[PDB]
Paper text:
Human angiotensin-converting enzyme 2 (hACE2) has been demonstrated as the functional receptor for SARS-CoV-27,8. SARS-CoV-2 cannot infect standard laboratory mice due to inefficient interactions between the receptor-binding domain (RBD) of Spike (S) protein and mouse ACE2 (mACE2). Deep sequencing identified three amino acid substitutions, N501Y, Q493H, and K417N, at the receptor binding domain (RBD) of MASCp36, during in vivo passaging. Cryo-electron microscopy analysis of human ACE2 (hACE2), or mouse ACE2 (mACE2), in complex with the RBD of MASCp36, at 3.1 to 3.7 Å resolution, reveals the molecular basis for the receptor-binding switch.
Specially, single (N501Y), double (Q493H, N501Y), and triple (K417N, Q493H, N501Y) mutations in the RBD were identified in MASCp6, MASCp25, and MASCp36, respectively. The same as RBDMACSp36–mACE2 complex, the interaction region could be divided into three patches, the three adaption-mutated residues (K417N, located at PI; Q493H, located at PII; and N501Y, located at PIII) were located at the three patches, respectively. The extensive hydrophobic interactions in PIII were constructed by Y501, T500 in the RBD and Y41, L45 in the hACE2, salt bridge interactions in PII were formed by H493 in the RBD and E35 in the hACE2.
Author numbering:
A (entry chain A): 19 to 615
B (entry chain E): 333 to 526
Write the structure that this text describes.
């Protein structure tokens, strides 16, 4: 009869088609990712082409329906998710050139290889070559050369490619009635026409601006401490008043600062917290790790993992007969099948990552009953948010003291806890400034406010002012440094990590205050508190059916992003830095350079 | 006087889909329920009107043993006063339901790699069903206004959809077989009990 009932009928049939197709594709991709064989990849690409062409033809069929002529919100949500044709709508020649741009840049980044100026046939690829090259080494010159060379080989190649990529993408977003493409990446967070939960695209930019504004002092003290320590490590290449070497950030870019922890141990005499030898002596295995993670998740009232999960998933390195890409991932093949893929060893890091993926899979187990297109987080960050919160909880000394991995007579106090805080900082506080710098940089690019002839030049200024890292090499318009990193080169929206970082800590405060916890947050656990578990489930069961901010409020009671969870979480570390930095400076100048001799 | 052949009913190997739910009339035999009860290896065994035991020595004039296969989460769908796809468009129960509903997991048999597609269920219909009616009439459901003359296409969809049964499913999506025993109490002579 009406339009809306017809749309619901359409979505109904589309559910039981797309569910099945996605199951086929996911299962094929799994059977590949577990056992590297050729015809596996063949059938995988077959099913993937099937699913993809089906999705495209469904989008074309769906755009035959008016949007505002639908009133029930859920239907509007599904139809905006489905009907957004995106790059598919542009001209077949230009879309082909685009596909080529993707594969070209990606393959050059993933196959680019830097070779020392002395040996044309001894040299290293990025993974895992340059990673360890920049991480394990202490060498000044090695890191310098590696930085510049990796910015030279692929980036200088991909420079015009990424240029025209931005061009075609912004034309594409215009075709999607978006002002530009960075706006389109924002558009996932955008929320329309629901009272008490409106959200504009620029509302997000205001959000991120303000969030980082209050973040500023935390990271500024962080930069101060790290600067002091690395100066002690490099007296001939760091002055304590300026930025930091862009080649000494433990990795090729400074996305994480965990590697410098080894260098900047807050107290190099107190034993660090690890139970690897312990889990060995107590004869544990990956199976038992995941069983204990299940026990934990039961301890919050969530349902224990499916029997099919245990009998089916691949949890350990499947011997040496077969190789696979077993990077830690958690798969939801839909239709009630959930698996975890990880070559699980036995260590504290695996113990954490196992809980991370268990959070992933539990999260997905929550919203099974929603329609298809709602089977994803309220945002593009909540997945890793829930995946990080469970890990953060389990990584407290006390929760380990619970299930017998630590000495019940352990003495945890000032120095060791500041060590743990600063480590977790280099892990998580590190991503805020760098991530936001890159995201807003790319946003201005899509906003074209920057002439191409100055991209790199303004680039480091953002690095300069916002994050505080100084370049080691003069950079003209020969550089394409953004693409020098995976997500940029592989064209992934990078805000989701900043948003995740904020959301997890809002979650932490919300759950610990709802678990009737008293005292320091950094020691918090949710387990055995069924009330907080019910609180969290009250949001998990939404996926993205409700507007995301309503889901957030259903946890924290704030309808927007908040950073004060983070600063509160750290305030021990905050005061500690505020003491440590009395005799050293915080803040830097935008002119300085290590080669400005 | 013969035993009611529940045996080759409950464990035959060819069960039809719901949209053509199978039915066999049981009468002119003595019925031994309590064995099927105390089988106790089923994943669900409910009914509405009598204790599992007392039904034994209290008897009816005729009964109908219907069978089909559905998806796990929808076992809840089969009960008086229940709604949902299999409840509204495929198998409808009366509210004064006299029978009993037994249901067991069958994932190790009715599903197979690649996904079985023999099993079906109707997806749309102009309106819900009467009590206890079978419908194999399969003319295209009219979703839009344009009469499209019996073809697949826009606003013209086929009323039947094939279940996806890959044995690696969650218990809620793994297939579940269902039998229902609708008893009647009428004026006919001594034909049903034991
Ligand atoms: C990997 O897949 C191939 C093809 O299906 C199979 O023959 C082989 O046995 C698999 N690997 C292992 C270790 O079973
Ligand atoms: C939207 O439709 C669903 C089912 O079609 C219904 O449960 C829901 O209540 C509807 N939305 C509103 C606001 O009523
Ligand atoms: C999972 O936890 C529930 C909670 O009571 C329990 O009944 C069930 O037995 C557990 N799973 C298994 C396979 O035992
Ligand atoms: C959780 O509760 C159980 C039951 O008493 C107890 O054995 C365990 O130590 C508790 N763990 C935590 C972290 O509270
Ligand atoms: C059918 O399988 C059941 C197990 O659920 C078994 O008890 C029964 O004996 C089988 N049928 C026959 C006729 O044996």
């Amino acid at each position: 009869s009406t339009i809306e009932e017809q749309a619901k009928t359409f979505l109904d049939k589309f559910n039981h088609e797309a569910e099945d197709l996605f199951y086929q594709s996911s299962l094929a991709s799994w059977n590949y990712n577990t056992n590297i064989t050729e015809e596996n990849v063949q059938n995988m690409n077959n099913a993937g082409d099937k699913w993809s062409a089906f999705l495209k033809e469904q989008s074309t069929l769906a755009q035959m329906y008016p949007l505002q002529e639908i009133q029930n919100l859920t239907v509007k949500l599904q139809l905006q998710a489905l009907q957004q044709n995106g790059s598919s709508v542009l001209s077949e020649d230009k879309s082909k050139r685009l596909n080529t741009i993707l594969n070209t840049m990606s393959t050059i980044y993933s196959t680019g290889k830097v070779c020392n100026p002395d040996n044309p046939q001894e040299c290293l690829l990025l993974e895992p070559g340059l990673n360890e090259i920049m991480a394990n080494s202490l060498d000044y010159n090695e890191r310098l050369w590696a930085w510049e060379s990796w910015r030279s080989e692929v980036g200088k190649q991909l420079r015009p490619l990424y240029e025209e990529y931005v061009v075609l993408k912004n034309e594409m977003a215009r075709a999607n009635h978006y002002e530009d493409y960075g706006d389109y990446w924002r558009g996932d967070y955008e929320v329309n026409g629901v009272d008490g939960y409106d959200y504009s695209r620029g509302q997000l930019i205001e959000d991120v601006e303000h969030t980082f504004e209050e973040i500023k002092p935390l990271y500024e003290h962080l930069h101060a401490y790290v600067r002091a320590k690395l100066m002690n490590a490099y007296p001939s290449y760091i002055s304590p008043i300026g930025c930091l070497p862009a080649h000494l950030l433990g990795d090729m870019w400074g996305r994480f600062w965990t590697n410098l922890y080894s260098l900047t141990v807050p107290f190099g005499q107190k034993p660090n917290i690890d139970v690897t030898d312990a889990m060995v002596d107590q004869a544990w295995d990956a199976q038992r790790i995941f069983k204990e993670a299940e026990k934990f998740f039961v301890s919050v009232g969530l349902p224990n993992m499916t029997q099919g999960f245990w009998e089916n998933s691949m949890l350990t390195d499947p011997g040496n007969v077969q190789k696979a890409v077993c990077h830690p991932t958690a798969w939801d093949l839909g239709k009630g099948d959930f698996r975890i893929l990880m070559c699980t060893k036995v260590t504290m890091d695996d113990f954490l990552t196992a809980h991370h993926e268990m959070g992933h899979i539990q999260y997905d187990m929550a919203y099974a009953a929603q329609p298809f297109l709602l089977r994803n987080g309220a945002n593009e960050g909540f997945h890793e948010a829930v995946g990080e919160i469970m890990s953060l909880s389990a990584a407290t000394p006390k929760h380990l003291k619970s299930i017998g991995l630590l000495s019940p007579d352990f003495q945890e106090d000032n120095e060791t806890e500041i060590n743990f805080l600063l480590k977790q900082a280099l892990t998580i506080v590190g991503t805020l400034p760098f991530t936001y710098m890159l995201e807003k940089w790319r946003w201005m690019v899509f906003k074209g406010e920057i002439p191409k002839d100055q991209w790199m030049k303004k680039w480091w200024e953002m690095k300069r002012e916002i994050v505080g890292v100084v370049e080691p090499v003069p950079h003209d318009e020969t550089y394409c440094d953004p693409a020098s990193l995976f997500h940029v080169s592989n064209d992934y929206s990078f805000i989701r990590y900043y948003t995740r970082t904020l959301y997890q800590f809002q979650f932490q405060e919300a759950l610990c205050q709802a678990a009737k916890h008293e005292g320091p947050l950094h020691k918090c656990d949710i387990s055995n508190s069924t009330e907080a578990g019910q609180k969290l489930f009250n949001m998990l069961r939404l996926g993205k059916s409700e507007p995301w901010t309503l889901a957030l409020e259903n946890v924290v009671g704030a309808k927007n992003m908040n950073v004060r969870p983070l600063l509160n979480y750290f305030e021990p570390l905050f005061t500690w830095l505020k003491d440590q930095n009395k005799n050293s400076f915080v803040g830097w100048s935008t002119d300085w350079s290590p080669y400005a001799d | 006087t013969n035993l009611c052949p529940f045996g080759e009913v409950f464990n035959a190997t060819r069960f039809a889909s719901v949209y053509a739910w199978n039915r066999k009339r049981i009468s002119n035999c003595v019925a031994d329920y309590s064995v099927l009860y105390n089988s106790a290896s089923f994943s669900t065994f409910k009914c509405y009107g009598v204790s599992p035991t007392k039904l034994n020595d209290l008897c009816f004039t005729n009964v109908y043993a219907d069978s089909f296969v559905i998806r796990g989460d929808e076992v809840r769908q089969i009960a008086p006063g229940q709604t949902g796809k299999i409840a509204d468009y495929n198998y409808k129960l009366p509210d004064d339901f006299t029978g009993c509903v037994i249901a067991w997991n069958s994932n190790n048999l009715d599903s197979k790699v690649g996904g079985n597609y023999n099993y079906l269920y109707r997806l749309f219909r102009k309106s819900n069903l009467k009590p206890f009616e079978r419908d194999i009439s399969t003319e295209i459901y009219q979703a839009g206004s344009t009469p499209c003359n019996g073809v697949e296409g826009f606003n013209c969809y086929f009323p039947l959809q094939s279940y996806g049964f890959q044995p690696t499913y969650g218990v809620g999506y793994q297939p579940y077989r269902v039998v229902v025993l609708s008893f009647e109490l009428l004026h006919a002579p001594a034909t049903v009990c034991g």
